[PDB]
Symmetry: C3
Subunit: 226 residues, 3 copies
DNA sequence: TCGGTACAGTAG
DNA sequence: AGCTACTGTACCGA
């Protein structure tokens, strides 16, 4: 992939692009993304029937293709996370010793069906996921518990990010500015071939299914960028 | 049942009313309504104890009788529905050819315990449920799955509207102004005698039970209109 | 006991009204009646701490290490603040007892365990007075009485009696929307099973917190000092 | 059934 | 993408 290939499908320049602005939203339209991918790999307790959270993501992506828009949502917990991310990144740079370059949005392949937006690409070749828990409660949970208390939606997000970029290891940092001390904590998460295999199987199935459903109602993927 | 009788029982002239103003809310106080009737017909997995959702609509309605107020809910989804309802009606009328008269409230009988407030009545004998769902996700869900997609709580609301109005069929329609094209979808629901019989069993008993509880506390149905 | 409170926090408990600023600060990382239902929850299965216990475990840990607490459930609390004085007056009128308001009461010198009564009555009973956000929940309690008071709230009342060492507590609901009969209350007697649960389980919660804090180089007390 | 917890599901 | 903050269903053992 190039910045250039992204101009031919969407007519947006990917370098003039801030993570959170109009252009960034448009580029994700109907694309399977790392923070949402947990809904794709979600399985029922029994049977072969899509759980509801996976059907809702299905139907949310289809609506993004056919409406060309994405609803704007707002909440303190969300505005908090957006407010502190920079400092999280700066503190994580200081402590870990690695340099972070910011990445806008990375697509896995030429179909632009799948993407992630890393919180950064480190100088040692790991990517970076930053969380600034709105609740000190959840930062505390991560601080004491480490790798093992990372929710599965977050594990799905990090692994899928490795699947997309082809990388082998990922930083997972939490930052809480209200902590008097010990307000940054992080781990390194190695690429998990069991997740990788699971995305090679499920993600192409989700895609073919979205393509089935759009045809039925007379839309095509890419229509959101036309 | 007619419009003079509502004045006698409630003080409210139904003719001055349009969904969903002040008096629109008054006329519903304490009234088992189609949007909420799913709570009434909810049944436990085993046994005969009223499930929580049933007990909770019970106390809600009771609280309406005794306070004379409904707490204002769902401002966001209602402001959206009110901004689009005229285009949705218009667009349903161009598309179906059918004329739609609005209806503020229809009670089932003189007791005035039971009622629906349809989005309209159609020149061909059907009623209308016309939703502008807040999320295009929901539009999409119904646009593809059709009939079987329909919120379980919606089927109940529809049937019950036929129970209340005696009518034999009902349009169920979704409108989404955001869809680039084909943003009205609609099906026709047939009156189901299995629901009708459910209502004939469970609704009278729900009413009697509200009546005992009001007598326990020295209240009487209809006090909300005094 | 008013003196000992200064030596830890510098705060005069006399300057203190329910909801204010100095108030919020005396509760940080303290195990409160309102939340104690999380401490005595039992697993659905196995014998590890259930999630809600862990979650409350992590919440107070964060109070200790941040020195702050978010304002949670704002609208219900604003509703309670709005009708507080009227609930009380109605309650005094109807029970015949006089209410003396009380800020925080700690169980002991440790200052690990505490409650905030809605009042202390002239008959020696404490008072929990809620103005339920929905009239629906008022209705539930009016119609159901003692046995429809939910689990979180029974534990709230009983813990209050554990902390204050009292034998009975009024549990009241007020609803100003109710056209008439908008007060309902009942008396809840000390339950020795709850006391025993608190005696076994609460100091153990406290010892895990301490251990937990040590791991990250913090100490209880640090939220104030 | 009952007295709860855990977690899917969804709103904001 | 943000990261909760709810409610109502499923599940678990007594
Ligand atoms: Ca992030
Ligand atoms: Ca409607
Ligand atoms: Ca209280």
């Amino acid at each position: 992939m190039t910045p250039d290939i992204i101009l031919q499908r969407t007519g947006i320049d990917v370098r003039a692009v801030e993570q959170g602005d109009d252009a960034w939203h448009k580029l994700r339209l109907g694309v399977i993304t790392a923070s949402e991918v947990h809904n794709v790999i979600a399985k029922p307790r029994s049977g072969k029937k899509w759980p509801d959270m996976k059907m809702s993501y299905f139907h949310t992506l289809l609506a993004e293709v056919c409406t060309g828009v994405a609803p704007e949502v707002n909440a303190k917990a969300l505005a908090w996370g957006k407010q502190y991310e920079n400092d999280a990144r700066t503190l994580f740079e200081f402590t870990s010793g690695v340099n972070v370059t910011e990445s806008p949005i990375i697509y896995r392949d030429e179909s632009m069906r799948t993407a992630c937006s890393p919180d950064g690409l480190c100088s040692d070749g790991n990517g970076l996921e930053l969380k600034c828990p709105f609740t000190s409660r959840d930062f505390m949970k991560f601080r004491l518990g480490g790798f093992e208390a990372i929710k599965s939606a977050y594990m799905a997000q990090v692994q899928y990010s490795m699947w997309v970029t082809r990388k082998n290891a990922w930083y997972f940092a939490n930052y809480d500015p209200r902590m008097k001390r010990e307000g940054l904590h992080y781990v390194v998460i190695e690429r998990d071939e069991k997740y990788m295999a699971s995305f090679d199987e499920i993600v192409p199935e989700f895609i073919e299914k979205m393509d089935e459903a759009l045809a039925e109602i007379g839309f095509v993927f890419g229509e959101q960028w036309r």
